[PDB]
Symmetry: C3
Subunit: 116 residues, 3 copies
């Protein structure tokens, strides 16, 4: 999976373990091996929300399988809680998009993904 965090929160404000913690949380949530879990953190990004530069997050979760409205809401709340705790962003400044990826439209290590 790929977890992308777009935030105007400065890198210096973010705990050094943030990506590791998000990796672990999303490995558990998505039941996906850590080996193929990416966290792409865009901190100090030039991202504004509502026309203002108060702290905000737009995050994406790209995953083969695992995404559905029930799991999405549970994971969104858990991700929001991590962003609130670690990035000091208000819940009403967080938006998360869940992006289903087809197995045969994603390569890893010289092959597509083999899912029955």
């Amino acid at each position: 999976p790929v977890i992308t965090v777009n935030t105007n929160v400065a890198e210096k404000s973010i705990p050094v373990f943030f990506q590791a913690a998000l990796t672990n949380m999303m490995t558990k949530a998505l039941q996906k091996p850590k080996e193929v879990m990416f966290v792409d953190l865009r901190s100090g990004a030039n991202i504004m929300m509502g026309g203002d530069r108060n702290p905000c997050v737009f995050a994406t979760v790209e995953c083969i399988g695992r995404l559905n409205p029930t799991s999405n809401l549970a994971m969104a709340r858990d991700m929001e809680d991590m962003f609130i705790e670690h990035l000091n962003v208000r819940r009403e400044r967080i938006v998360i998009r869940f992006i289903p990826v087809p197995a045969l439209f994603c390569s890893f290590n010289g092959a597509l993904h083999d899912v029955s």
Copy 2:
């Protein structure tokens, strides 16, 4: 909604009100609350087009509802006009992708979206 602008035009060349202007223009175009409009500007990006480094833009518009061929063309032309004016990019150096987002695949403020509100 999320407007993402990937451009090789340098930040110093871009009007300071570009993201505000794009926010306002796309809030009106998409008829979405301004408060949930993001504009993510990647200026001075290492993006080449056609194998050359003349000014270019690849932009994306992520939105729950609102995107359809008619609205996409109208918004593309309006975005191109703003990119031409603000970034001094030629219309033939602009590509925009419109990305429909499912209501139940997008959270805001501790909840997913309501299809009927969106």
Copy 3:
């Protein structure tokens, strides 16, 4: 089409011809006009994989048409080979997502695309 390369490999480590070479290779592979081929290289990105900061790539290929399991695998292997050779990333640290784009959901030069 848009080829987006997200890598923690530093810009200074990447051959000056890399984006040009990838442009040419993917113009041929996708049979799309070179004029509308973007390569958006995000080098020195803060992207970690497997909880560690060994060299990695997450790349995307956004294309109207052309993407299917057969073409995806062939292009993936060719892109992996370029990443291995030029970015010194191991094949087991490369993931590529192929993203089909609808013709009427993408503009170029004041018009949507032919469908």
